Amino acid sequence: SILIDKNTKVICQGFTGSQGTFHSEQAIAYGTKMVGGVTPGKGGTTHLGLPVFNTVREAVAATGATASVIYVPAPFCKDSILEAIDAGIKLIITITEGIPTLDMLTVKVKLDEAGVRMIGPNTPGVITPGECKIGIQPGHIHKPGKVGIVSRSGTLTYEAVKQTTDYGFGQSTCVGIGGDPIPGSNFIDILEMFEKDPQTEAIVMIGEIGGSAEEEAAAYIKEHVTKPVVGYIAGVTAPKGKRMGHAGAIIAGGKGTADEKFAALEAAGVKTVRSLADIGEALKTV
Amino acid sequence: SILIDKNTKVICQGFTGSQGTFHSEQAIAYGTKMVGGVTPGKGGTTHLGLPVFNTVREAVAATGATASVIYVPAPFCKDSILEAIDAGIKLIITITEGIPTLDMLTVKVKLDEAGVRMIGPNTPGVITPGECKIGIQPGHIHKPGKVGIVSRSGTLTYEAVKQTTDYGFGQSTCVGIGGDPIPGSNFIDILEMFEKDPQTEAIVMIGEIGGSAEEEAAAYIKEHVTKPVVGYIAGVTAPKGKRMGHAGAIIAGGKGTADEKFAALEAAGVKTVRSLADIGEALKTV
Amino acid sequence: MNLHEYQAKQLFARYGLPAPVGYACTTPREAEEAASKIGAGPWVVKCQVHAGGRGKAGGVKVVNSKEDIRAFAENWLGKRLVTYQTDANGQPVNQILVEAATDIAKELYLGAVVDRSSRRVVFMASTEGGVEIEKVAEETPHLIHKVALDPLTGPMPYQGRELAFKLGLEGKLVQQFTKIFMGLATIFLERDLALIEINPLVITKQGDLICLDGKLGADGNALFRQPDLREMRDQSQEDPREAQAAQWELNYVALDGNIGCMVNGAGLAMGTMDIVKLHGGEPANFLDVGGGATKERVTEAFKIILSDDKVKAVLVNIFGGIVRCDLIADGIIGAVAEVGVNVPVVVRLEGNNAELGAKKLADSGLNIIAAKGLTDAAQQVVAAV
Amino acid sequence: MNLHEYQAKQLFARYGLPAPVGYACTTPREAEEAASKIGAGPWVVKCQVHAGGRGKAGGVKVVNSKEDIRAFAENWLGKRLVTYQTDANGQPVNQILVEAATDIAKELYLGAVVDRSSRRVVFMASTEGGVEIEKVAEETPHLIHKVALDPLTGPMPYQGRELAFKLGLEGKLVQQFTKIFMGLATIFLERDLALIEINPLVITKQGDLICLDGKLGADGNALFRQPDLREMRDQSQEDPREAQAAQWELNYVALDGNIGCMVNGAGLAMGTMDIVKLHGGEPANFLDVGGGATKERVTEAFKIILSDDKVKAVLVNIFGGIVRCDLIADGIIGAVAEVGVNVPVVVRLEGNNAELGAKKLADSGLNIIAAKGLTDAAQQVVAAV
Ligand SMILES: CC(C)(COP(=O)(O)OP(=O)(O)OC[C@H]1O[C@@H](n2cnc3c(N)ncnc32)[C@H](O)[C@@H]1OP(=O)(O)O)[C@@H](O)C(=O)NCCC(=O)NCCS
């Protein structure tokens, strides 16, 4: 598995809010090691049986948490992400959707410069079936296994999870890198992690129109990924120049089309599927 | 020697200006490998027998220079220093005095982040007697030798140079780190360089009131400098809170006095002298 | 969101960047009165629509009399202009920009976007103005010059100078260019822009730089902190159904097909359209159900999808979410029933109680085919057509 | 350069940061008229001088009648206030700040400077307001909290919050503090400041934060791009000779001694003062000759140094520079001759033609001892006294 496991201690920024409460509850049920949350002005109280703090730094000092999930509304994410980086957090999972591009641009530079890892924003989360769950994904469809999944989307990912669970392969860890233009981590970042992960025997890569993260991963897979990879790209029927939901799902300058990415992954010897329904099948074929 | 030698190719930013012309001329005479200068709007012409370019990038592409000396007036240094960093220059010597503190603060971060080395600003320059001269210092008083010099001042440095030349020791390389509050390189940076330099057998450290670069070097010398170091601090008779010429020569918060620095260097076992006249002597004593 | 050329120039002006003297007009009377305010002719009249290629479509002209300005205005106000960047309906022209003619010496190109690859804001300059930059790129790439804004230091003069010199400018044109570069870079960062395109950036016979045209795009995600921009949105320039869907927390985009798609998730939405296309179907739209699939939201979805007479069938594909499939099945039934859907509806539920839901659907008595598996669902909707 | 408290508060106001309601007055009449404009008393009257410790010196008082305000004003306007931070002459009081009294609940400390050690702008907060922060530091360091501004991102709310919580604030006082933090950080960066000190930053009985006092220092090197600040400089608060020297490109600072020093270079200047002190002398000043040692500039130097009656001798020490020692020797002779120096003058020339110059000096016939070596020069000036 990668990023998280049964021993990862996690705090929640936006802990006392609607989504923060609901999903933290789900995580606790799943068995995730939630040790407390942060909500400026509500420090000193307790929520979901856990301690609430005024600052990320206080929370870390008291719980030694190393990961933080963010459920803070867009307007304040640049602030809470930078606060986490400063407090010492090493892993940040930002669920929030709607963060300004120019904000992530700066945050991304700081993340790299500071050596902190962030998954997202605009992602369903990260999950190591059986060990740890951080995000909004339905736990009951996952199964401890050997396939690692990396996707730019949410519900589309569940399809691959269901299939890999049905064929019995199960999942090592599921990482949603998010649907924004400038994510904290991209395909290559996660791919390299799966390569070094002994528990991961195969990799499912799920992408969509927009940008060139996929094309760049293709070249990287050819060059540094020895394990088998099944890839799927959504957006063949999409029009150029229009945003299809995700802030990143847009074909700009006529570059970054669905077919373009399929072709790229194939030239790198990646098993690509043209029906999201056949991911499980193609996997068995390896 | 350190930083520069007989093979260092050098370009001049502010090449066609008054100081840029005069001192570039002196450098050429000394034998420095000046290969061209940069002055926006005067590209395509020739000055002092060398080519003038419109941008640092053009100059580098044509001469392969790796070092740049800056003679641009303060208001435009942040711009020309960042231009050099971008063009690929690896060594920058900024002679300019009067640069805004907040400007150097940002430039310093970029320098480190980019892995580029800058001596200054507000410095007489750098010189490896017999091999290369970059700055405004009088060449005829130097002599190829074994003593390396690091100073926060200008003319005060010449005293040490004359003495080391007179006692026959000579100099390996002379580095003026400048008199500003936030310099490109500090004592420790240069010290470490002298330690690895086989040609340098001894080190003369010249400082003054203000800040704590000296105290910090003391600790570093104790810990990582094995060669002998003679140190001199100016400003014993100076008043607290007043600027004594150099933008950095000011005792703030009552901390950073002359005696304070002497004491610090002594606690680290550094041969300190209380009369700038006895530097040569103390050196012989080692 | 996009802004009109006249709106973009007004902004460049606020930031001290040269633009022709002009006036936006809503009536033929304002248009002809603009002439005298501008000065002596000839004058340029331009229809204002978000799409480009207005010239080729005849929406841009140079006229010589107030009488002609008036004729141009009475011919376009109220009509829809159709360019190579619009659908067949084109866009409504509710504003005519009337400005002073410019003595063109040379046409340059200056733009800026957020390069997803290098993760920086990047400016492009070229001597090939007045041409679709994309072509210049693929054909003569060496004629396109770029610089990236440093997140740590912000735009710097040496960068504006670099482009100027690469474009061969010299003399006062170099400072003028740098000023424009610094200005646009500042707007980009301050107003949270996404796109900037000065095409062409003209050098006048009199020897000055002036922005003959301008295109701006703002980051929608940042409008919460861009009060002025927020107010400049022109709804008429888009499909009304789009804004209507956004209101109910749905993402919609119309297409050409007879098969409607209602899916939860953007990726899954596109994937479902693709699989329908794969089995010989023609997707009529893209509709990603953002909020929970309540009876109310699903109802709005149907109404919006079906507002297109081309739709003959509707494929619904929903995976998990925050509700149970049996509950969602009820909502879909309630929805279909209340809207009175007059076409076959193939549903594909998956997740918690997937079967219990399929059951309720199969028994609804309504025209609802409860598919088994995505491939099945796809084949059936394509069939029902 | 430094600003007056009233000038600082006016700036904080422009940036929306609370300060008492007040007025700067130049005549006793303006002072008493201020009372009614402010409201009901009592009122606070404060002498305005750059130095601190005004209170201990009796320059700060709370009065109860217009009559008293008038008396205070007539007593200080025109006089020089002497504090533990001024020389014996103190500084001229040309302005009386008259403001509304404040109901103090608690006194805090908030400041900012450029930490040379970490190379960042750093803000300090403490619950120990109304006290020389330096003392709080060395005695109870754990009561001083700091944060450094990130060059890449600029000030951030979470930082203002951090300090607020460490100070034990809560409720609306937390947002109020953060606002003030963000504001001061912004001023610091935008106006190129060097120092900021709100001491004390008061919490009122009514429960609000207000800046009872304020101290600003601007980076002189940046004034070329700070038009407003440039105009706020108050020459009267410094030694007039200093500004006078700067005009002729000389750096001067007066001391207590009988030996004047004229040296080229700040480091060498301090070093020469030190060596004189070392051999039993008492340096009367610091004078670093910036520009070339021309006859004219050297003349000004002499005039300025000798303007101090305490000076009995003058030591000149010049090393190289951009001229030859023989030429400089002539300039010194010309200078001494034209000023008509009435005290011994020991000169020490070094560099190109050092001896040829020493000769011209020894033969000038004037009262000029041409020393051989710095130590010699030092011993001789000390001697001549
Ligand atoms: C992040 C998001 C869920 C927030 O929505 P929400 O939880 O309903 O917001 P709420 O107002 O209920 O709660 C937010 C809380 O953030 C907190 N908050 C604000 N600024 C904060 C900061 N800097 N640090 C920590 N907490 C902060 C507040 O405490 C607030 O709730 P409270 O004050 O009532 O306790 C929403 O903006 C979002 O991104 N939704 C999309 C999720 C999504 O679809 N993701 C992609 C899936 S693939």
Ligand SMILES: CC(C)(COP(=O)(O)OP(=O)(O)OC[C@H]1O[C@@H](n2cnc3c(N)ncnc32)[C@H](O)[C@@H]1OP(=O)(O)O)[C@@H](O)C(=O)NCCC(=O)NCCS
């Ligand atoms: C830098 C300094 C030496 C300039 O003085 P100067 O040479 O007389 O200034 P000039 O105006 O003659 O020349 C400056 C040149 O910079 C150029 N310039 C301006 N911006 C530039 C940039 N970004 N890149 C390159 N050149 C630039 C101009 O082209 C000008 O030359 P020009 O006359 O051909 O136009 C002066 O600002 C200074 O700081 N002196 C302090 C010296 C000192 O005390 N050093 C400490 C040593 S101990």
